[PDB]
Structures are given as C-alpha cells and as structure tokens.
Amino acid sequence: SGPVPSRARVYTDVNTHRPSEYWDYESHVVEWGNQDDYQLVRKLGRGKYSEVFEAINITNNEKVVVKILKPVKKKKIKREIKILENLRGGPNIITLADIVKDPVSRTPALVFEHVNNTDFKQLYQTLTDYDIRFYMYEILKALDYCHSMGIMHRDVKPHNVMIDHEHRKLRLIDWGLAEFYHPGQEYNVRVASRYFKGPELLVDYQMYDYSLDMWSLGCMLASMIFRKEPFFHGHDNYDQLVRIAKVLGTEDLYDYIDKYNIELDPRFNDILGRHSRKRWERFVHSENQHLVSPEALDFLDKLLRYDHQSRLTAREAMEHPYFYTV
Ligand SMILES: Oc1cccc2ccccc12
C-alpha cells in the first residue's frame, strides 16, 4: 500500500516546534534595496538561471559577489532568500550581505560576501592528507549547523564548496535547491548533481532527509582521497544507480528497496544487472596512497551506504577517528 515511511534520526522536529514564519517561505516578504550602491566589476561565471559578478559596494569600497538570478521561477528565490537569511552568520555558510534590484531592468539580485576562491583543479593536486581532513571537518560544521536549523542543502558538490586556501577559509554556497525538513514530507527527487545524487532519489523514494547531504559528502570524500573525479560516474540518472551498484553490490539495493517497499522503475530492468560488494582498498593506487588510511576508509564506508538511515549524521561524522588530527 505504497512506500514505507521514514524520518531523520537527528533534528527530526526542529521545524515542527518553530513558528510558521521560519519555514513558510511563500509568506516571507522580500524587500529589495537599490542596486545603484553596487558597481559590477567582472563576470565570474554563468549558471542555468544565474549570472555571477564580482562587484564593489560604492558606500564602503568593499568587494562583494552579485548573483543576478534569472526570474525563471519565483518562490524558489523566496525559498533561497528565506534559507539564506535563516542561516546567515552560521559557520562556513555563505553570507547573504544584501538583496537588490536594478532600477531599469527590475531583475532580482543577491549580494554575497566575497570569497577569493582557489580553483578546484588547482586545489585537488596540492592538498595533503591533513588538508582533506581539515576541509572535510569545515564542511561538516556547515552541514551540522544547517541540519540543526532544519535545512537540507540538497546540492552538495565540489563546485558548491568555495575555499580561500591562503586564508584556510571555506564556504558552502548555492542554497537554491535547499529545503526545510518536515518529518513525513514527500520531496521532489530531481535535486543534486547526478554524480552526488543519493540512491533514494534514483529509486524515487520521496521521504528523504538531511542524510541525502551525507551521501553527497561521501561522494566528495571518495573522489578526493582516491583522486577519481567523479567517483560514481553515471551518464544519466538511471546509469548513476548502476554505477553505485557496481561498488556496493546489487544485494543491498534490493534489501534497501524491500526495507522501504520501493517499486523500481521498469527502465532499470535491462541495465541493473548483478554485482558484488567491493573492498574500499581496491581503489588504492600509487597516485593516491598518500591520501588514504584505514581511518579514511572506515569513515567513507559509514557515509556511502544505500540505507539513508544507516549513514553517519554530520554530528556523528565529526566524532570519527579520521578527524582526531584536526
Ligand atoms: O580539500 C577538500 C576537501 C573536501 C572537499 C573539497 C571541496 C572542494 C575543494 C577541496 C576540498
């Protein structure tokens, strides 16, 4: 009679005991300042619904980042602004400094604190075993904080992790896919980048929680310690699950779908196959052995699990021996 329900093991009722104003983003009143206080300097990047610029606040001569959001869908922006305002000031959370509109275009624009980002492809080659442990712990601080605030990022990936390595500063950015956790709520599974999508989304199990973020974090850790980017290299959403199965075996996938009474899409019939559970040590090679340790492997094993309930919470992850040196 449908799928078996599930709930978060931590911060389960944090939003339930909160007033609706905190999580009712649809009712949140957004007030837009004048963009004339900001002078655009140069374009930094371009997203599907966003153009990002480096800018100067002409009232204090401070550099900022301006995200000109394309009004593809309102409420989503309301959701992102409400979440950004709720988390504003939290450890390693990007600071939303202002919300503005250009007088002529009337285009919505989010103003963030400036982060002097080190290129990922440049970072990935200079980071030591210590650096990986350090930055993973910084990400866990941001995740345990937003989960405690009843929020799941739902888009954890390297490009959403901004690091100023010189200043050892880290920020979790892009909260446009983030959502408020409400126990028993069925969410849209079309979230996260393919490589970091958790098995719950690929099997279309809508009653997921903060643990989705812990799966994505595990994908990042695996790519970093094994120097294989991405780790689960799917070519589509269907193939992505097949790639997870090629490492965690097809036995636990059926155990997981049976535990939650999940109906597998017929598209999986001819592509899924039969696979065995691999030892994490099989991914160790000469090029990555300086980043691997029994602690790192035990920690990874406890994040990359089919069962979202069985994964370490961000708070449990922070207590792992892998972080004793931080
Ligand atoms: O050093 C790292 C550790 C964990 C995650 C990272 C994400 C981006 C760039 C570097 C990272």
Residue numbers in the entry: 2 to 327
Any passages from the paper?
CK2α is found both as an isolated active CK2α subunit and as a larger complex, with a scaffolding β subunit, and is active in both forms. Previously, we have used a fragment-based approach to discover a new, cryptic pocket located next to the ATP site, termed the αD site. The work presented herein describes the development of a series of CK2α allosteric inhibitors through iterative cycles of X-ray crystallography and enzymatic assays, in addition to both fragment growing and fragment merging design strategies.
The original fragment screens that led to the discovery of the αD pocket identified five fragments which bound in the αD pocket. X-ray crystallography showed that fragments 2, 4 and 5 bound in both the αD site and ATP site and so were of limited use for probing the αD site.
